[PDB]
């Protein structure tokens, strides 16, 4: 989660 | 392109599942 | 402040 | 409107309001109609010089989305600050020239990116070379797209930091016949158009329409709004260029003005003998 909350929409891509 | 659209429309609570 | 952002969509944040 | 017969060099001007509609989105509806009308005019033997504006809005919108895509969720916590005082402008001018090309490559009319600063102007020997260049470019049936470079400037006299005045100066320098100032409203009213007290006028008399023109209780400032527009028009008229202010949310109007159908407001140096 923290990773998800500390990620870039570009990263999420 | 469709993956981009899906990610643009998704809700953060949906990026976990 | 938090919950909204959590459930909102990247598009939405662009309002 | 008798001058409409003998005009073969016009300087139209689309303001940011005309170009952009919602959320830094090019008004494809308005811009397309205006470009189509300009292409039809060009074909009918008319030197059409286009002075456009709206790069700042497009740059602001695209740099917004280029922040949120490259932002961390934590960042989304606090409303982001100003994007920039000049970079939005840069990106937006790029985008606008891009659009124009794409559109003018459908009706086969070539355009050139001529960007001029206030310092470049006022430089002796510049007010000429620009002149000659623009003349040759018009001669090969090309439509220039003038603008004010807001990305390499240092202002943060001469041009009035507005394309509207830029239009005026260029028109006087390039020795144009007419300068059109397409805007959102149907012309120069007697104040704010919302209330019924303000009434549209059709000719700007020097000593008549300078007592009931507040330019809105609202002072635009950013684009100088109307006051600036009226000033530009007056200056252009005085130098020897008739100037007409008209709505731009309807391109068809341009043909009516050029053909002569009593539409808009006239800022003519022949006010006494009219
Ligand atoms: N005296 C007036 N009569 C009619 N409308 C007015 C008056 N004063 C202010 N306004 C309003 O303010 C606005 C001023 O428009 P403005 O000239 O700033 O747009 P613009 O030409 O796109 O500016 P720019 O291109 O420099 O960004 C008009 O849309 C008009 O509705
Ligand atoms: N900065 C905008 C125009 C600024 C203005 O409204 O005059 C551009 O370069 O296109
Ligand atoms: Mg203005």
UniProtKB/Swiss-Prot annotation, chain A:
The chain holds residues 72 to 84 of 726 of the full protein. This is Delta-1-pyrroline-5-carboxylate synthase B. In the N-terminal section; belongs to the glutamate 5-kinase family. In the C-terminal section; belongs to the gamma-glutamyl phosphate reductase family. P5CS plays a key role in proline biosynthesis, leading to osmoregulation in plants. It comes from the Eukaryota.
Swiss-Prot record, chain B:
P5CS plays a key role in proline biosynthesis, leading to osmoregulation in plants. In the N-terminal section; belongs to the glutamate 5-kinase family. This is Delta-1-pyrroline-5-carboxylate synthase B. It comes from Arabidopsis thaliana (Mouse-ear cress). The lineage of its organism: Eukaryota, Viridiplantae, Streptophyta, Embryophyta, Tracheophyta. The gene is P5CSB. The chain holds residues 69 to 85 of 726 of the full protein.
